Write a protein that binds this ligand. Structure first.
Ligand SMILES: Nc1nc2c(s1)[C@H](c1ccc(F)cc1)CC(=O)N2
Ligand SMILES: [Co+2]
Length: 288
């Protein structure tokens, strides 16, 4: 394991193809902090091919970092190395791993997370129906790609989708993602989680489909909190008895059918991401 408890240097293996030299990065304004790191805007030279600086997001350790946070940030970086380029994913761009603090460079999304983006645009240019379907389609396309790369996200939610300046949706926060014992799937927020993840301690692409269903509900409620009024301690009992969230007012019947299919108890009866892309493509085309 890499450890902060060294008196020489960093103990991270070199990976030249991802390394960016430090003079080619200028750190800028803070964007915020998460569980195991902070994010700052930066400009990076020659990492997307002309010496023009590109704005990126830099994830780094917090001032109150732990040794585990180092391990976690390295693991996140290593997962992202394994995920190829896709327009609807936040991709790794580079890293500064030698000769200084650990910096993980990822694509920048100027409008922040989808959940806050939606909530900020609640009626009281509005978000239209077409905008909502477009958001859902783009996330589905991202997830279809992830699944094809044999990657389970495990933490899909509106909070973990970012929005670019040009309103492109990019799936983010790969800290829990796995390349496909008793506490397996214990770090997954239960309101977004397929029941089988906890009851059977398995996780497949079809489990991610359940989460996508919850995300769809979040989109059409403009960032509503799932299962409002129901405590996490009561949730699985209600779900086992067949309760499902009600149709959002912004959702049409056809979209609500898609959403409810994603919450089939039986994973194999949920649609695949390839099927969801097809379904949402159809909706998006008719609405234009
Ligand atoms: N790739 C990114 N682009 C942005 C991100 S991460 C930002 C962010 C992510 C996680 C976190 F804990 C704190 C801040 C917010 C933002 O406006 N753009
Ligand atoms: Co069915």
């Amino acid at each position: 394991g890499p450890t902060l408890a060294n008196v020489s240097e960093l103990e991270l293996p070199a990976d030249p193809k991802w390394e960016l030299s430090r003079a080619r990065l200028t750190l800028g304004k803070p964007l915020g902090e998460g569980a195991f790191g902070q994010v700052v805007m930066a400009e990076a030279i020659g990492i997307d091919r002309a010496a023009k600086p590109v704005t990126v997001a830099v994830k780094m350790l917090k001032d109150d970092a732990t040794d585990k946070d180092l391990s976690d940030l390295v693991s996140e970086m290593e997962m992202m190395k394994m995920i190829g380029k896709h327009k609807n994913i936040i991709n790794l761009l580079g890293a500064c791993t030698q000769g200084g603090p650990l910096y993980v460079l990822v694509e920048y999304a100027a409008k922040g997370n989808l959940r806050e983006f939606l909530r900020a645009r609640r009626p009281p240019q509005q978000l239209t129906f077409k905008d909502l379907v477009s958001c859902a389609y783009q996330v589905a396309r991202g997830m279809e790609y992830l699944a094809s790369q044999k990657c389970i996200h495990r933490d899909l939610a509106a909070r973990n989708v970012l929005v670019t300046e040009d309103n492109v949706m990019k799936i983010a926060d790969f800290g829990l993602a796995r390349d496909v014992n008793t506490t397996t799937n214990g770090r997954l927020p239960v309101k977004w989680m397929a029941p089988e993840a906890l009851f059977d301690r398995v996780y497949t692409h079809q489990s991610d489909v359940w989460s996508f269903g919850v995300l769809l509900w979040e989109i059409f409620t403009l960032g509503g909190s799932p299962y409002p009024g129901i405590p996490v301690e009561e949730l699985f009992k209600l779900l086992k008895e067949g309760h499902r969230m009600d149709k959002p007012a912004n959702c049409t019947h056809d979209l609500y059918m898609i959403m409810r299919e994603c919450w089939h108890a039986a994973p194999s009866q949920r649609p695949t991401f390839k099927q969801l892309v097809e379904d949402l493509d159809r909706v998006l085309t008719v609405t234009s």
